[PDB]
Amino acid sequence: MPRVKAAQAGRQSSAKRHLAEQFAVGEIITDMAKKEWKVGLPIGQGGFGCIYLADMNSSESVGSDAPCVVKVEPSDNGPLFTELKFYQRAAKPEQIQKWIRTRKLKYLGVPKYWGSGLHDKNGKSYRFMIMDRFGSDLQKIYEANAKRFSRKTVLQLSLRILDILEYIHEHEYVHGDIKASNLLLNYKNPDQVYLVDYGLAYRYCPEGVHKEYKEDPKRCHDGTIEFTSIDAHNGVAPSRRGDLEILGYCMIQWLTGHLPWEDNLKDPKYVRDSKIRYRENIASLMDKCFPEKNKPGEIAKYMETVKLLDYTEKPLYENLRDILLQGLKAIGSKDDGKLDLSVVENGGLKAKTITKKRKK
Incomplete structure (x- = not known):
């Protein structure tokens, strides 16, 4: 004997937002390269998560400081030391041009190093690294x-x-x-x-x-x-x-x-x-x-x-x-x-x- 049955539909949830208002946008942080980077918009996404975009101070003609992003990592240090050590060691304009050209290589898939440093915030030290805008x-x-x-x-x-x-x-x-x-x-x-x-x-x-x-x-x-x-x-x-x-x-x-x-x-x-x-x-x-x-x-x-x-x-x-x-x-x-x-x-x-x- 036939019976009819069907009850199951609809399952999608989307809820992300990024408005700080109080304190976040415009926080300038000086890295080891001695540049004070002005954080702009919280992207949240990237090759880690909680990644911020650099708005910087638009005086008249910003150099290369604007088209970059920064990863945030706890100073307790997980992957950061290994990643940043290699990052800073490999992302070297001089060396990159040299070995890439001489080894007849196509292109190194490593983001350009701009800056990196440590900023203690609210009593928790966060280390930040500046990479190419993804x-x-x-x-x-x-x-x-x-x-x-x-x-x-x-x-x-x-x-x-x-x-x-x-x-x-x-x-x-x-x-x-x-x-x-x-x-x-x-x-x-x-x-x-x-x-x-x-x-x-x-x-x-x-x-x-x-x-x-x-x-x-x-x-x-x-x-x-x-x-x-x-x-x-x-x-x-x-x-x-x-x-x-x-x-x-x-x-x-x-x-x-x-x-x-x-x-x-x-x-x-x-x-x-x-x-x-x-x-x-x-x-x-x-x-x-x-x-x-x-x-x-x-x-x-x-x-x-x-x-x-x-x-x-x-x-x-x-x-x-x-x-x-x-x-x-x-x-x-x-x-x-x-x-x-x-x-x-x-x-x-x-x-x-x-x-x-x-x-x-």
């Missing part, structure tokens, strides 16, 4: 553009990632979880993407000593089990193979729309299984991930190549750079129209703390 994040763009990233989009994304991964991973740091929220687009220059959330920066080779992958005690996992791979999740510091592995996962993610172990992001066995399962026959699996009229050959060859270099036998990012660009150029694309991500959406995720040993 307005677009790949997390909200993921939603708004339905994660449809074309070859030229993914290629350009991974291209700049290759630049930065070599620069950072040649020294000491890693980044296990490559999340869409890690990539921030310049608010008024979308073709140039920056990376933040350096809390997922674990050290593999201290100073410059290539140790050995056995840092794994039981579990550490910097970031989500999604892109962190088996390596970082177990707690082991990955070599070039790790970074290459993670990048491959993000590339196929943007190219296909969704990861099999992401729909299964509720089970450690399935995520591990699926990753190993696909890596068994990378060429076959990658090409068969999105079979219709798509060309996933660049990824297939890339993945075969990265598996072919063992773990750190012969890792050459420029060689991977070559194959990817060669494939892209084969279909008639080469830095097509300066990226493809002009969605300019704002509403990503938050930054995370370093897995130094224990977070309780």
Whole structure:
């Protein structure tokens, strides 16, 4: 006997506001560069959260002080010291121009350092760091553009990632979880993407000593089990193979729309299984991930190549750079129209703390 039933609809809540009025707008703070930055509007969003925009004093012709934003971090220090130390050390106009030009690199995805300092407020010392003005994040763009990233989009994304991964991973740091929220687009220059959330920066080779992958005690996992791979999740510091592995996962993610172990992001066995399962026959699996009229050959060859270099036998990012660009150029694309991500959406995720040993 038939029965009729249906009662469930409507579930969306939106409630954010930013009016201070009393005390906030116009608070000038002098950083270590000896500039007194005038905070303007509370954005709240960014590669961390609670990020402010710099209004500054518009006397007559402001220099470069206006087009910047500032992250706020407690002086108790979580990711800040690691992030800022690298930030200030890497964001050096002189050095950037030099090594980028000489190493034939494309572009470093690191925000320009303007200033940074400490300001005790109400008895709580907050340390602030001034970065480039961000307005677009790949997390909200993921939603708004339905994660449809074309070859030229993914290629350009991974291209700049290759630049930065070599620069950072040649020294000491890693980044296990490559999340869409890690990539921030310049608010008024979308073709140039920056990376933040350096809390997922674990050290593999201290100073410059290539140790050995056995840092794994039981579990550490910097970031989500999604892109962190088996390596970082177990707690082991990955070599070039790790970074290459993670990048491959993000590339196929943007190219296909969704990861099999992401729909299964509720089970450690399935995520591990699926990753190993696909890596068994990378060429076959990658090409068969999105079979219709798509060309996933660049990824297939890339993945075969990265598996072919063992773990750190012969890792050459420029060689991977070559194959990817060669494939892209084969279909008639080469830095097509300066990226493809002009969605300019704002509403990503938050930054995370370093897995130094224990977070309780």
